[PDB]
């Protein structure tokens, strides 16, 4: 009867009890330990967008993706990342990862200029660079014919394909980069289907660029073909990602450190190693985790 343990009921609070068991885990380390052996993917001074597009300012296997909240390094060229939040949701659960030259810069684009598709808004070692995973396609000496490259998924895995749509500030810019004044874009997959046209307008100098680039993405199921029809403004893919999805994987946005420790349960506040069914540490959890509660103790 020696134990001073206390339980609570609907009617009266703080009642001393002999035999009683806890349910809540309040204790944790400030460390972001590797989940079940496998190390996480930390993107310091970079966000998912920058890493996935191939921003020059910025590993295959990981347990979870870490991002510094302070990290703003993503779209070097100004624009709008379409369904970016929806892309994070899809990239939450990711085991394997193969980056491959879907449409290699060498062969794939022969009736177009691939080498002049670089800007100062996207620098790397002082040089005018661009995103490594996608080519900015411009006219091959005053002649931009209708391009129509198509990829057929042979990887067996879900293939993530990213591409851009350049919106020139002046009408003259469209006529100097693609020449075709009434240019269109089309991306056809079994699940994805959208037509694009450039929104020619002078916008504020964001990263000292008057024009903008919208960044679009889709997944291609194995066996399915993704077609790319364009007469201008398309920023074609170079590298795509054949990925194998995991279950217990997510995205942590925390400034907490990461150490060589192992953990069964991981939260942005820190790792947890408990047999308890409930936890009051943090609502975001990765792996076999005790369901979050706001309670003091249970």
């Amino acid at each position, epitope marked *: 009867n020696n134990s001073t343990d206390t339980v609570d009921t609907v009617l009266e609070k703080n009642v001393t009890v002999t035999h009683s068991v806890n349910l809540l885990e309040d204790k944790h380390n400030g460390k972001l330990c590797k989940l079940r052996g496998v190390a996480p993917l930390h993107l310091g001074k970079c966000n998912i967008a920058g890493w996935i597009l191939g921003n020059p300012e910025c590993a295959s296997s990981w347990s979870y993706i870490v991002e510094t909240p302070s990290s703003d390094n993503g779209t070097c060229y100004p624009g709008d990342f379409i369904d970016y939040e929806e892309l994070r949701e899809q990239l939450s659960s990711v085991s394997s990862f193969e980056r491959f030259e879907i449409f290699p810069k060498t062969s794939s684009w022969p009736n177009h200029d691939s080498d002049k598709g670089v800007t*100062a808004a996207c620098p790397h070692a002082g040089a005018k660079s661009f995103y490594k995973n996608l080519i900015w396609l411009v006219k091959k000496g005053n002649s931009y014919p209708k391009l129509s490259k198509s990829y057929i998924n042979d990887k067996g895995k879900e293939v993530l394909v990213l591409w851009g749509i350049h919106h020139p500030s002046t009408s003259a810019d469209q*006529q*100097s*980069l693609y020449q075709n004044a009434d240019a269109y874009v089309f991306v056809g997959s079994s699940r994805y289907s959208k037509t694009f046209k450039p929104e020619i307008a002078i916008r504020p100098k964001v990263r000292d*660029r*008057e024009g903008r680039m919208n960044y679009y993405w889709t997944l291609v199921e194995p066996g399915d073909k993704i077609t790319f029809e364009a007469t201008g403004n398309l920023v074609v893919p170079r590298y795509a990602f054949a990925m194998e999805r995991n279950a217990g994987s997510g995205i942590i946005i925390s400034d907490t450190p990461v150490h060589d420790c192992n953990t069964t349960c991981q939260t942005p506040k820190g790792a947890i190693n408990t047999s308890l069914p409930f936890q009051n540490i943090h609502p975001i959890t990765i792996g076999k985790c005790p369901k979050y509660v706001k309670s003091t103790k249970l």
Partner: antibody
Amino acid sequence: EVQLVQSGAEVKKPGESLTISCKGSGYSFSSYWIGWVRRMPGKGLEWMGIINPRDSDTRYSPSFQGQVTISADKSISTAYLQWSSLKASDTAMYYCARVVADREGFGYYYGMDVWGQGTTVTVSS
Amino acid sequence: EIVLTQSPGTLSLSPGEGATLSCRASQSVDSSSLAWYQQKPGQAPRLLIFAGSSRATGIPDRFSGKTSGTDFTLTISRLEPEDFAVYYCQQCGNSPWTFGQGTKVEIKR
């Protein structure tokens, strides 16, 4: 407003040193390239050169390279057309102009929009 | 020098007629490098068409730019009394930038 205010009329005897201004007003002077166009009495328009005021780099025409010197002061937002030694052939009408180019930084030049009033230079003994 | 030779020498038109001005280059130049200017007597030049076909900042619908091969055209639908001036073409491709000969548009009488 978006206007270029050039230097006043100048009359000097040959051999002398003359420098004519061109003041960019109501815009980011350093963003746009500034050129220079000569017009001789009873002749056509001759292009002299261009300066990017932020880069302070000059690209002279073969007919004007070495002879005349194109200066630029981004701080005062003023372009210059400095003369080493004046020739009787330098008796002309001189214009400066804001050059139109691509917003992607590629080097495509579309012509020149904002023009100066015109500096009247007389070079006679 | 990429010699620009304007045709005709002078255009004699009645205020209301349609003007068509040619500018044939020595060698082939980029369309986006070509521009059309209007100079009035005792006045600084004005930009009408820049980048070959793009209409300048505050220019009426009547003024239009065309290019195919080496021809290069400045077309006006209605010639207003204000339109009667000297018209120049200019290339901005191979340095030095050269200006055309210049066609004067005079009131036909």
